[PDB]
């Protein structure tokens, strides 16, 4: 909950970068013309954004594996089950990440959140 570089409170959320920063960070050239908000005023927006993204991926994952289960119930179908495992990997990691961000604190929720958003957009 503290900026390791400046030793100040991490309480500002930059919309350009999706990072949680301190007031001295806000002055640096990195965020010269960036719009910041209080962490306490963007949490709900992103929390609901990740909740829906988690739900839609859980549904897509449930559909995928119920199908993958029928194949495995027949047993080279083995290589097909291997493909499904490799294709759905990034979803399993993303689902895990969102479950961590939602259950945890506001720091874990928002830091680099916009990066997790764009990864969700990819699938």
């Amino acid at each position: 909950d503290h900026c390791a570089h400046h030793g100040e409170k991490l309480v500002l959320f930059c919309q350009q970068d999706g990072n949680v920063i301190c007031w001295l960070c806000e002055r640096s050239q990195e965020h010269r013309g960036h719009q910041t908000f209080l962490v306490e005023e963007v949490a709900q927006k992103y929390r609901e954004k990740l909740q829906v993204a988690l739900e839609m991926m859980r549904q897509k994952q449930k559909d995928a594996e119920t199908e993958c289960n029928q194949v495995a119930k027949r047993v080279a179908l083995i290589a097909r089950g291997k493909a499904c495992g490799e294709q759905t990997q990034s979803v399993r990691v993303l689902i895990s990440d969102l479950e961590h961000r939602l259950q945890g604190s506001v720091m874990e929720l928002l830091q680099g959140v916009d990066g997790v958003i764009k990864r969700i957009e990819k699938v």
Copy 2:
């Protein structure tokens, strides 16, 4: 002298609200587009504004009661003295408030000061 919500120093005076706030308060949506100044740079303006308002009300109160004393010196004049007591109430409370704001600290002086101004304007 501290913001109970954010634990920061109350050193900023918002002109839109007439409140003494902290730097994190200044970031919240409550003061999205409000002009703030240092508490130490608006005290004199408001101090003299309240001094004159106190003086003009003390004079109006002195005139009123000297008149109210003549009536009571006759003794239903009793109900007339009761009316005067009810009519001049808000002035007695305002005079008291200003005496508290002027004698005390800068916090008591400026917090919600603009609210006391508009009440002074009413009479």
Copy 3:
């Protein structure tokens, strides 16, 4: 490294004044419309600016005294050596100041630096 007036960290450099100030200083009327930067982001600019200024004055001083040495090697030439001592005084003090600013910390480097710049410009 602390603002004696406000007790806050001296981490902001005002370009209009050439002073190192705190965030409460930045709010005062003194710097109403001044551009500030992080001390950590202007040090290099001024450090190199003073390095070149020191070098050019050391060279001008070396040339001057080697000439002053020839005169003193003859010995009223004494009054001429006295004039040289009085003429080159401000350079000897400026050279000393720059050597102090460059060797020391960022505070000593930048505080009132722009004042030392204009004195360097005079010669």
